[PDB]
């Protein structure tokens, strides 16, 4: 009725556990995007904030495992292509070379959408080598799988 399967249910607790530290038995609000993303999920912080405002009317940040499960069951059908994320970069390219200016990346990733923080875009950069960045080499990197 989730609708989900056990071998999945195997995969998720492994991840659920180590974020559940207290033994009080739940992950914090802020502990859901990092455990979502940790298993093949790429959710927008808006989607995450929606989820929070749904479960938590308890005035604290707590989530049970079945509601967790039923928070992970629809999102598998939420496919996200690669030629999309490839074009999303090409939109931000002065040329069509495939090399993106490291500044116009920091500018975009920090002025548009769900703004990334100063430390996010620095370490995103140091993972993407070298004044420029081969965003076509960065997408295979993040989408080889």
């Amino acid at each position: 009725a989730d609708q989900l399967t056990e071998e999945q249910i195997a995969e998720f607790k492994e991840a659920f556990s180590l974020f559940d530290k207290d033994g009080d038995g739940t992950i914090t609000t802020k502990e859901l995007g990092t455990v979502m993303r940790s298993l093949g999920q790429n959710p927008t912080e808006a989607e995450l904030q929606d989820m929070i405002n749904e479960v938590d009317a308890d005035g604290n940040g707590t989530i049970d495992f079945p509601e967790f499960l039923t928070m992970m069951a629809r999102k598998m059908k939420d496919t996200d292509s690669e030629e999309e994320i490839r074009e999303a970069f090409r939109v931000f390219d002065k040329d069509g070379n495939g090399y993106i200016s490291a500044a116009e990346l920091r500018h975009v990733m920090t002025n548009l959408g769900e703004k990334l923080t100063d430390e996010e875009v620095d370490e995103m950069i140091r993972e993407a080598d070298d004044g420029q960045v081969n965003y076509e080499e960065f997408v295979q990197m993040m989408t080889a799988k």
Binding site: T34, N42, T44, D80, A88, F89, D95, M109, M124, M142
Partner: protein, 721 residues
């Protein structure tokens, strides 16, 4: 290549053809909104509007001269480097000749625009150092041209009373050979008479002010403006003008331009003859039908000692006229000749000076040459008291605009046919009715003003105006006190007529039109001056050679211009034209002040809103199907990421997806046409909000990969079972 657009980070609206609604309100408020963000350059199609910042702006960087290198207009924000680029590429690839026409009120930066056009060109033409061997002589020559061609009017303390052309000459490879300077349409009338509050040309006041008494005693002069008729008593010292200093700056500039001190000394002798030549008075001979006669011969004697001419021949010249015999001149006819000899000696010397500079940087070699030139003609003038002088400036601005509004309209109609798009007759303002009203050779003002000066009878200003009133009455662009508007305005007084220009109605005063139009240089004066001992004075008057045909002259003054404006429109047409509309935001030379009042006047003067209606021409936006898709394909989920190819049908199905009506656009054979900007701003807004979803996509995916990678690595290190 590059995939940019001027619509990106657009402050206000860069190309005023995207203006909606198009009224003067929204126009002034857009060159103010931009101005406050230091965006002084704005486009009307291929035209740049330059509002003076009155400071240095960091947009004239070397990184720009390359950012704007070999790029179309829309590919980057508006900037004067986009006009200089079009010019250079057209010069370079088409072997065309380039004229750049700069129009506006003095102080608008027309001196600065031309310096930024030519300093771009030097940076990209490869042979920059050789180019700047020319921009420096043209600079060091400026203070002389100004002294002889600029003057203080009731609104500009340094206004240029002539048309200015300069160019730089390359060969058909790109190697620069030299330059030229041309002078146009000099206000010769200003020498002999000036209005009140205004001032004669600079060089007269610079000479008497800062010539050492020793130098004033070689020329029969004296430091006293109250002693000279061609100079004014009160209006002879200007705020923050040290003519003494300027004279040292004009004496230096000649030295470095290449004047032997004999040459220079013989130049300042002729400024001294002309100044003292207006001191000669005449009185009737024993006089109802009698003759004329000098009053005094002292100042005449000095002129002859100085000029080395023969008093007997000038005495006879100012009084008689040998033609066909030797008829004697009336007193009025004799003053008209003392003046005609003055202004036709100043102009001939100024034009002489210009061609003495060009000898320096004339292109030695006789090979074909391309031209990169700038024409800085003088701004429209609506004064409190408008006279004959302003008539020319405004008639010149009307010839140039009509030539431009039709060229611009011709080329837009020539594009709507390339793309199989229908034409819609633009109910615009045909400027030709005012030109015809003026320069017609039958019912013109010029012809009927000349025709009152050809009468031996007695003709004053009120007969010429009551001539206009008789024949110019029914011309809807001519209104006077007895001619006949249906608007509730106070009636016009006598001795004035008003006509409607493309820049608005201007009220002209008739006092002087007959005197300022008598430019009678009859041969007895050219001949008496060809008999001079002055190597210069005898060189300005070649018709004084008895050998040369005794034919005629330019019979009139308005005639002498209608021909001088004709040779300009005829030269300017043989060239590839681009235009810069230079604008002053404040009279007070202030950096960051913008007066909607003063700028709006210039919006009229420059005729800017007709340019927008003319260049809009129905459809205001057009873009080739390829970039129009690569830019907006991300708006429907059928073009993203591809395609639909090819582009015309991908764009078609894109618009029929955004539910935008079909009346709002049209399909050209290469470009898509959009009528109103309000659509293009809807597409460029959706794009702004779609890209906020592409960023969020990259952001959401980098966060997932960074956390999923941080987790498996971690739980791969669980090998501590």
């Amino acid at each position: 290549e590059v995939k940019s657009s001027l619509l990106d980070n657009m402050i206000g609206v860069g190309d005023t053809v995207l203006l909606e609604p198009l009224n003067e309100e929204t126009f002034i408020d857009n060159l103010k909104k931009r101005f406050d963000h230091n965006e002084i350059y704005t486009y009307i199609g291929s035209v740049v509007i330059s509002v003076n910042p009155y400071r240095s702006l960091p947009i004239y960087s070397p990184e720009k001269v390359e950012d704007y290198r070999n790029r179309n207009f829309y590919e980057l924000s508006p900037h004067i480097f986009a006009l200089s680029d079009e010019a250079y590429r057209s010069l370079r690839d088409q072997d065309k000749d380039q004229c750049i026409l700069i129009t506006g009120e003095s102080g608008a930066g027309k001196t600065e625009a031309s310096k930024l056009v030519m300093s771009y060109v030097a940076a990209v033409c490869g042979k920059g150092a050789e180019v700047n061997q020319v921009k420096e002589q043209l600079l060091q020559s400026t203070p002389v041209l100004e002294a002889f061609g600029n003057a203080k009017t009731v609104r500009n303390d340094n206004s240029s009373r002539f048309g200015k052309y300069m160019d730089i000459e390359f060969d058909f490879k790109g190697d620069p050979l030299g330059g030229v300077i041309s002078n146009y349409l000099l206000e010769k009338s200003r020498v002999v008479k000036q209005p009140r509050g205004e001032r004669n040309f600079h060089v007269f006041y610079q000479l008497l002010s800062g010539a050492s008494e020793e130098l004033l005693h070689k020329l029969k002069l004296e430091r006293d403006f109250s002693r000279y008729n061609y100079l004014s008593l009160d209006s002879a010292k200007v705020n923050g003008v040290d003519d003494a200093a300027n004279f040292r700056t004009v004496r230096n500039a000649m030295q470095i331009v290449g004047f032997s001190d004999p040459e220079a000394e013989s130049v300042l002798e002729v400024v001294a003859a002309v100044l003292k030549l207006g001191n000669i008075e005449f009185k009737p001979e024993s006089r109802g039908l009698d003759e004329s006669k000098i009053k005094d011969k002292n100042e005449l004697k000095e002129i002859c000692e100085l000029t080395s001419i023969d008093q007997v021949v000038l005495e006879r010249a100012f009084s008689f006229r040998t033609v066909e015999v030797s008829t004697t001149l009336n007193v009025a006819q004799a003053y008209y000749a003392r003046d005609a000899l003055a202004k036709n000696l100043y102009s001939r010397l100024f034009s002489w000076l210009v061609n003495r500079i060009n000898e320096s940087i004339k292109a030695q070699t006789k090979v074909r040459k391309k031209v990169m030139g700038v024409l800085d003609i003088y701004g429209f003038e609506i004064f409190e008291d408008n006279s004959f002088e302003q008539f020319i400036i405004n008639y010149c601005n009307e010839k140039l605009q009509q030539i431009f509004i039709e060229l611009t309209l011709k080329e837009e109609q020539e594009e709507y046919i390339r793309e199989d798009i229908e034409w819609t007759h633009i109910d615009y303002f045909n400027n030709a009715i005012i030109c015809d009203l003026i320069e017609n050779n039958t019912n013109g003002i010029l012809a009927m003003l000349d025709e009152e000066c050809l009468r031996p009878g007695t003709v004053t200003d009120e007969t010429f105006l009551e001539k206009l009133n008789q024949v110019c009455a029914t011309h809807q662009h001519f209104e006077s006190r007895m001619s006949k508007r249906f608007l509730n305005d106070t009636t016009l007084p006598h001795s004035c007529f008003r006509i409607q220009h493309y820049a608005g109605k201007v009220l002209y005063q008739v006092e002087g039109f007959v005197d300022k139009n008598n430019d009678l240089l009859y041969r007895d004066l050219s001949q008496a001056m060809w008999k001079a001992g002055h190597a210069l004075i005898k060189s300005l008057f070649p018709e004084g050679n008895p050998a040369k045909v005794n034919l005629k002259r330019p019979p009139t003054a308005g005639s002498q211009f209608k021909a001088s404006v004709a040779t300009l429109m005829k030269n300017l047409q043989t060239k590839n034209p681009n235009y810069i509309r230079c604008i002053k935001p404040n009279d007070k030379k202030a950096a960051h002040i913008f007066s909607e009042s003063l700028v709006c006047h210039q919006i009229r003067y420059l005729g800017l809103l007709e340019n927008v209606r003319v260049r809009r021409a129905g459809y205001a936006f057009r873009q080739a199907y390829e970039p129009c898709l690569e830019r907006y394909k991300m708006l429907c989920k059928q073009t993203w990421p591809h395609w639909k190819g090819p582009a015309r049908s991908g764009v078609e199905v894109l618009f029929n997806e955004l539910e935008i009506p079909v009346e709002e656009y049209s399909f050209g054979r290469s470009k898509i046409f959009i009528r109103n900007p309000r659509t293009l701003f809807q597409l460029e807004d959706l794009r702004k909000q779609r890209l906020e979803d592409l960023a969020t996509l990259i952001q959401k995916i980098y966060r997932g990969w960074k956390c999923r990678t941080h987790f498996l690595l971690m739980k791969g290190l669980n090998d501590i079972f």
